[PDB]
Design a binder for these strands. Structure first.
Ligand SMILES: [Mg+2]
Ligand SMILES: [Mg+2]
Ligand SMILES: [Mg+2]
Ligand SMILES: [Mg+2]
Ligand SMILES: [Mg+2]
Ligand SMILES: [Mg+2]
Ligand SMILES: [Mg+2]
Ligand SMILES: [Mg+2]
Ligand SMILES: [Mg+2]
Ligand SMILES: [Mg+2]
Ligand SMILES: [Mg+2]
Ligand SMILES: [Mg+2]
Ligand SMILES: [Mg+2]
Ligand SMILES: [Mg+2]
Ligand SMILES: [Mg+2]
Ligand SMILES: [Mg+2]
Ligand SMILES: [Mg+2]
Ligand SMILES: [Mg+2]
Ligand SMILES: [Mg+2]
Ligand SMILES: [Mg+2]
Ligand SMILES: [Mg+2]
Ligand SMILES: [Mg+2]
Ligand SMILES: [Mg+2]
Ligand SMILES: [Mg+2]
Ligand SMILES: [Mg+2]
Ligand SMILES: [Mg+2]
Ligand SMILES: [Mg+2]
Lengths: 63, 59, 153, 402
RNA sequence: CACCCACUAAUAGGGAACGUGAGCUGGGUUUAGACCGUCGUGAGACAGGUUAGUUUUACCCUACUGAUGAUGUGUUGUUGC
RNA sequence: CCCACUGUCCCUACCUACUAUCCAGCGAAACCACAGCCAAGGGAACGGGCUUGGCGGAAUCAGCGGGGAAAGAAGACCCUG
RNA sequence: AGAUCUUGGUGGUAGUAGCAAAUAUUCAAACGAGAACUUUGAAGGCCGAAGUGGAGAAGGGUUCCAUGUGAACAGCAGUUGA
């Protein structure tokens, strides 16, 4: 239903921002049950939460 | 059925079209439209503008 | 409960009521005036059309500033609107009254809205903040509604 | 106190109900004075404003700086396909004005005309005049029509013909014909009744109504401009930049007394779409329209006797926002009220043309057919082709299909 | 007001709450700051001069401007006076 | 005061954004003897009402700033105590 | 019946003024009775390190954090919320 808590916890576990947290839209219900950082940790290992890569800011044009 | 004129771009100007420019030096030009006129006023060379007659004849 | 305009015989009739409904009184009064005397199936289709902005309700009494529309020409009027909340509220009241007829065992395919009335409810107080450190009311104008339907065909 | 310096007022008070015209067609409102010595003729016509262009001609005004000189002049093309006479109206002069004595309608009213009687032709069953036309064939109906024609003969002063345009000959989206009453002038009531009777169901071209270089009057509705402020509507002076509430206003709308706003004060409201008549519009040409004998004969539309070029009045790329002119047309001189494809009423002049400005023969030299959808510079397709030569689009056309 | 320059057929005189500030402007007059001259012992004054100085509200009735409509001709439409 | 510069002006036009506008939802306040079409008359000497005349046709929308000597403040000017 | 009387209540105005400062939203799905406003994902943007970022002092005082509700409040709505 609502994943405001899980996005906040996943950010803290991944040591990234909420910008870079990817909660799988297919497994909304599975993520919704994870109400603790330990269940979040297993979600990240299993692949239901992915830390997205940094937005590209290339310096090739400057180089 | 009047005199038939030719522009800065070499195009044929039918009566009732375009403008006429008489400089102080005594020479008179006729233009077909403000595109051709402002090209001439900014001293652009018609031999380097591709759609101009003098370019087509040159190349 | 005490209704106004009890029917000529409450054996072919059913009633619905609502108190302190959160709709504008002026809007609901105009909508109730439009559907009065209508066949129940006609009022159902009409109030659905008002939500879809296919038929307008004519604003006759409370028409200060109300704009003109082409659909007002179905009525004899010039000003009309399409109050969605008033149509929604009267639709729920019509479904409630229809179900009451099912309880009373009389056929619902011939009901006609013989009586309908919108009363002003006690107001609800809110607050608005104005220019030089002043407060003015932001009151709401809820309304009571009642209706009586009868068998006739 | 008096205003410091005198200045004329803005706008004329002779058009004061500055409202949307109650009509769209444009009413004649005055037909020329009827006299019996002249032959029988029609006094009006209906055309459509096709567009504008300019011409070149030789002026014959002695004592002028343009005498024996070439000039260019703006002209307005008005498409005038032949109208169809479908009825006759009698009028009787009462001490309260004219009143419509009797109307007689011809058999076989065309479908384009019968559209005028319906707000919704699509859902209609097209029953208009179906029982009326039945009386043209039975004995009691025909005998009644004879009695109604004879009653017009002995009781009516002026008679008019109902005529309608043929909208199917126009490129417009509208298929509904325009009806109008056209007064028949020039003769006894019996004579104009016999003339109009034989024209029933027939076609009346513009050649038989108007003539070359005669001054006529154009009646129609102007372009709409919507709601407009006083600066656009009455052309009043703008207030300075420093004005608080705004500067496109009239500063003083009246003195303290008479304590009311006068009708003569410029105020914001509807501008445009007004019914106006303009007099003394000279006819420069009457085109022949398109005609097929063995091929499509198009040249004489815009071929002057000095041009001798095969081209029509149509510009290159067609008239902007109107379409292609194919029927007969009338080339008026100067601007004319209205938008494009706006129905115009053309009326015989109420005055008598005696000045040298009128009764001056027109002798065209050149008719501009360059594209009006931009800065056109070629009169015809063939002139454009000869100047530019073959292009890439025509190269692959001659390459793919050989 | 006045006077001057120039054009013009002529460059007439006035009223409308000394027309017209919910139309404007704020130059002047007519607040508070300040300078000079004159008067006053002084606070201060000056149809004496000078400089800086907040211009609010309309959505109400009518008027006017436009825009739908309304009466009655059985309904409705076209053309008209 | 001069050069330059320009929509300050001659002389206005066009474009863009947000509004205003229409709709869904929500929803005030100022003000209010009664109200609201005028000419003249007389009258607390400038009437919406009174007299005499002109007349008067539901219900309304968008504007408007002529009036309501419009609203805002028991006039700060002047006089009296 | 009056006192720009006191207190309380109610009208017209009026469904009117207005809900116009700081560029901007869109598609699909989920839960849900109900989605312009909630959640997720995909886009398009903004703050642009003197930030619309991460932390404190004063002041607040439990607003912090979970779960639940949909009465009232959050000047539309809400499945959301200080
Ligand atoms: Mg406020
Ligand atoms: Mg405050
Ligand atoms: Mg004068
Ligand atoms: Mg006059
Ligand atoms: Mg100002
Ligand atoms: Mg063009
Ligand atoms: Mg004055
Ligand atoms: Mg004033
Ligand atoms: Mg003012
Ligand atoms: Mg000043
Ligand atoms: Mg001072
Ligand atoms: Mg001294
Ligand atoms: Mg001095
Ligand atoms: Mg200053
Ligand atoms: Mg109003
Ligand atoms: Mg408004
Ligand atoms: Mg009076
Ligand atoms: Mg006092
Ligand atoms: Mg006082
Ligand atoms: Mg009392
Ligand atoms: Mg009181
Ligand atoms: Mg509003
Ligand atoms: Mg707004
Ligand atoms: Mg940026
Ligand atoms: Mg920070
Ligand atoms: Mg919280
Ligand atoms: Mg709310």
């Amino acid at each position: 239903s609502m994943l405001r808590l899980q996005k906040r916890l996943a950010s803290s576990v991944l040591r990234c921002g909420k910008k870079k947290v990817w909660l799988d839209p297919n497994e909304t219900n599975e993520i919704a049950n994870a109400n603790s950082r330990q269940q979040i940790r297993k979600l990240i290992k299993d692949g239901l939460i992915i830390r997205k890569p940094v937005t590209v800011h290339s310096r090739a044009r400057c180089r | 059925m009047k005199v038939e004129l030719c522009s800065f771009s070499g195009y044929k100007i039918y009566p009732g079209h375009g403008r006429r420019y008489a400089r102080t030096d005594g020479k008179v030009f006729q233009f077909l439209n403000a595109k051709c006129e402002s090209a001439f006023l900014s001293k652009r060379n018609p031999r380097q503008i591709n759609w101009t007659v003098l370019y087509r004849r040159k190349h | 409960v005490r209704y106004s305009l009890d029917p000529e015989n409450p054996t072919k009739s059913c009633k619905s009521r609502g108190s302190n409904l959160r709709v504008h009184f002026k809007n609901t009064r105009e909508t109730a005036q439009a559907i009065k005397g209508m066949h129940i199936r006609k009022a159902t289709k009409y109030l659905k059309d008002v939500t879809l902005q296919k038929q307008c309700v004519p604003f006759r009494r409370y028409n200060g500033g109300v704009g003109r529309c082409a659909q007002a020409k179905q009525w004899g009027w010039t000003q009309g609107r399409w109050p969605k909340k008033s149509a929604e509220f009267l639709l729920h009241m019509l479904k409630n009254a229809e179900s009451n007829a099912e309880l009373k065992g009389l056929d619902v395919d011939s009901l006609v809205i013989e009586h309908i009335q919108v009363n002003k409810a006690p107001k609800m107080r809110r607050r608005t903040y104005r220019a030089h450190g002043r407060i003015n009311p932001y009151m709401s104008s809820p309304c009571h509604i009642e209706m009586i339907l009868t068998e006739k065909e | 106190s008096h205003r410091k310096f005198s200045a004329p007022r803005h706008g004329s008070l002779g058009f004061l109900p500055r409202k949307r015209s109650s009509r769209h067609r444009g009413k004649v409102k005055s037909f020329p004075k009827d006299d019996p010595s002249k032959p029988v003729h029609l006094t009006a016509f209906l055309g459509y404003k096709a567009g504008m262009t300019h011409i070149v001609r030789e002026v014959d005004r002695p004592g002028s700086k343009v005498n024996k000189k070439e000039v260019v002049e703006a002209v307005t093309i008005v498409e005038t396909p032949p109208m169809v006479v479908v009825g006759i109206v009698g009028y009787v002069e009462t001490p309260r004005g004219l009143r419509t004595f009797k109307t007689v309608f011809a058999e076989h009213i065309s479908d384009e005309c019968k559209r005028r009687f319906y707000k919704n032709w699509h859902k209609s069953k097209k029953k208009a005049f179906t029982k009326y036309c039945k009386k043209w064939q039975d004995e009691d109906g025909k005998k009644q029509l004879e009695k109604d024609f004879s009653s017009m003969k002995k009781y009516c002063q002026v008679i008019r013909v109902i005529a309608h345009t043929q909208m199917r000959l126009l490129p417009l989206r509208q298929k509904k014909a325009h009806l109008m009453e056209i007064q028949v002038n020039g003769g006894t009531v019996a004579e104009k009744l016999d003339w109009a009777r034989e024209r029933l169901e027939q076609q009346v071209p513009v050649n038989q109504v108007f003539g070359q270089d005669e001054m006529i009057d154009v009646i129609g509705v102007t372009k709409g401009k919507g709601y407009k402020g006083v600066t656009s509507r009455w052309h009043t002076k703008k207030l300075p930049r420093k004005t608080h509430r705004g500067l496109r206003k009239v500063a003083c709308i009246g003195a303290w007394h008479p304590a009311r706003v006068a009708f003569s004060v410029a105020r914001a409201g509807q501008k445009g779409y007004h019914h106006r008549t303009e007099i003394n519009k000279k006819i420069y040409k009457i085109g022949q329209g398109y005609l097929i004998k063995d091929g499509k004969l198009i040249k004489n539309n815009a071929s002057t006797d000095y041009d001798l070029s095969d081209k029509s009045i149509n510009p290159l790329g067609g008239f902007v926002h109107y379409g292609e002119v194919t029927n007969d047309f009338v080339m008026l001189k100067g601007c004319v009220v209205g938008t494009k494809k706006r129905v115009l009423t053309l009326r015989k002049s109420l005055l008598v043309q005696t000045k040298r400005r009128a009764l001056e023969k027109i002798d065209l030299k050149f008719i501009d057919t360059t594209s009006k959808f931009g800065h056109g510079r070629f009169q015809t397709m063939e002139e454009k082709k000869a100047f530019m030569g073959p292009l890439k689009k025509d190269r692959i056309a001659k390459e793919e299909g050989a």
